């Protein structure tokens, strides 16, 4: 694969990406239009890596939404099949991300928070209606371009409402995603894994935008539970019983019963409607949390809310392919079939 005079793309420079790491900022040499090119090296060498490549390709090809990262192109194999070893994915060019924005000397007024939260929830309403749970939402995974467009990226951890018992995370839910943004159901293995997982992460991100500091920056497993309880208080007897691990259950039962700290105390002088919505997201019980679609209907987002401009995704996405136990070679065949289908649907 080359990027010379006769080739489709011109490599401008190597840049960073909060969701996908090292990418090449490039221009489609025919239009001059800027894009990001992600090389997935040795894509077929490791089962879990090849499975991730196929999962992301299928999820991104399923979605067509301005708040979700899109595939602009996929380079076809330029060598014989046996030699095809690295995949080149052409994506929307996104210069920054919410992590970089929050944690810099850039302005981040209440209006910036309101608009970024709106875009995130808009993308989530669509994703969630397709039966897709991101499971790893965090400010670095929320790409932001020069036109202030926010796009959800990195679907590596994404799953449906049904998962395979064959994969390790099915039991080891406390290792699903990132500690600082991990929903209590994942941390405690509460056997209730729905789109509600994402709304806890949204809450953590929303709080972080408001204070420009991480809300629950736990140093380890217990410290993470500790920090959550210092604000939310002691979990109810019902969730304590649903904790299927004696040591965790016993550490919770060991500290003094604590009352929830009003959000207005955690964030002094912050906007009322903002804390009203924030409180609806950060609840221990996944069934207690407001949904992405109900959140779009909240007064805090009334400035941007337009139901005719916040679509659902039809039909739902099917994770059956991912539940299959495929060899590295059968995954390679499925990825090559995805690339061919991408181009077949274009012409
Ligand atoms: C180091 C980073 C986090 N890795 C990463 O971006 N990977 N790793 C794999 N296996 N696949 C990807 N990215 C990817 C795969 C498919 C599409 Cl359509 C877009 C992006």
Numbering used by the authors: 47 to 393
What do the paper's sentences say?
The ERK5 protein, which is encoded by the MAPK7 gene, comprises an N-terminal kinase domain and a large C-terminal domain containing transcriptional transactivating functionality and nuclear localization and export sequences (NLS/NES).
The allosteric binding site is located in a cleft between the P-loop and the αC helix adjacent to the ATP-binding site. An intramolecular hydrogen bond between the amide O atom and the aniline N atom forms a pseudo-bicyclic ring system that maintains the compound in a planar conformation. Formation of a hydrogen bond between Glu102 and the hydroxyl group of Tyr66 from the tip of the P-loop stabilizes the P-loop in a closed conformation. The side chain of Lys84 is displaced by binding of compounds 4–6 and reorients to form a hydrogen bond to the backbone carbonyl of Val68 from the P-loop. Glu102, meanwhile, adopts an alternative rotamer allowing the formation of a salt bridge with Arg98 and a hydrogen bond to Tyr66. In contrast to the P-loop, the αC helix orientation is unchanged upon the binding of compounds 4–6.
